[PDB]
Amino acid sequence: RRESINPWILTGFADAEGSFGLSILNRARYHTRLSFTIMLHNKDKSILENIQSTWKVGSILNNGDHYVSLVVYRFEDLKVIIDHFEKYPLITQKLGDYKLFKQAFSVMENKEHLKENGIKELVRIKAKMNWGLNDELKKAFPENISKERPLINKNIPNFKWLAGFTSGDGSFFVRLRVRVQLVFEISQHIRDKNLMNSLITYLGCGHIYEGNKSERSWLQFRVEKFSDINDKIIPVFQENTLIGVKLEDFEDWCKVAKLIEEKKHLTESGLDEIKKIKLNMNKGR
DNA sequence: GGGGGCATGCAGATCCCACAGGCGCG
DNA sequence: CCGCGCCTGTGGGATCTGCATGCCCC
Ligand SMILES: [Ca+2]
Ligand SMILES: [Ca+2]
Ligand SMILES: [Ca+2]
Ligand code: NA
Incomplete structure (x- = not known):
């Protein structure tokens, strides 16, 4: 199909339904994955199909038998998200999670995360993102665990x-x-x-x-x-x-x-x- | 050749949705 | 008396968010 959403209408929907994620899982190799996700019921599956059509980026995966989500996970894919939210900023408290999301993109863009100091900077960023660091990740990096x-x-x-x-x-x-x-x-x-x-x-x-x-x-x-x-x-x-x-x-x-x-x-x-x-x-x- | 990121998901926590009844007031 | 609308209250699922990895490329 074909569809396109107004840029400001999309930011408002992100403020309501979007989510910026930064996962750091053990592989001392670490799986670091930036993402932006909007999970909705299947009744609204066409929005995510249309938002994917507006940004011309992102993947749509099934989550259970009744839900669907648009997830943007590739590095080059995340550049369009920041460029959209730099000109159409988020308004709710989620904008703070986006700000930390943008900092994490720059650290990964400079390949700094491939070293010990780069991982320490992102776990400090993750500390202030959404629900902060989990108990296992808080065992290490207790420097700036302030959420x-x-x-x-x-x-x-x-x-x-x-x-x-x-x-x-x-x-x-x-x-x-x-x-x-x-x-x-x-x-x-x-x-x-x-x-x-x-x-x-x-x-x-x-x-x-x-x-x-x-x-x-x-x-x-x-x-x-x-x-x-x-x-x-x-x-x-x-x-x-x-x-x-x-x-x-x-x-x-x-x-x-x-x-x-x-x-x-x-x-x-x-x-x-x-x-x-x-x-x-x-x-x- | 292998380390990191891509592909494609699955699982947990909660913030919503879509209402409800009581009742004072014009 | 009628009916509108302020006011308090809420179950539970549609959200928000977190967790997971074999495999691809370069
Ligand atoms: Ca919301
Ligand atoms: Ca909704
Ligand atoms: Ca919502
Ligand atoms: Na509605």
């Missing part, structure tokens, strides 16, 4: 980025309690609270719910007023369209919202049509 990293406070660059972030970690659904209510919600780890609260001002609507800050690792940005949803959330994603099955979930979302606008959610066939839309909305296509 903490400078936090990343950044603002939303554009709505094209938001479409890719929403396509990842967002959700469009409809509640029936009978009464009809459309709800838009984005969840995220508490580490990007300042970025999540940016959406209140960036969108002019929505609320932030956290619960007990202790013993809960993630907050929620949610908008429930229909006026804010029909006027300030749906047009902004019609101009900057989403990707993956989230688009079709969003498509049927506005189809239901059009019925609520015409006040047609009182007829028996209106809710019967609304219920049929929901029956294949998120559990289905």
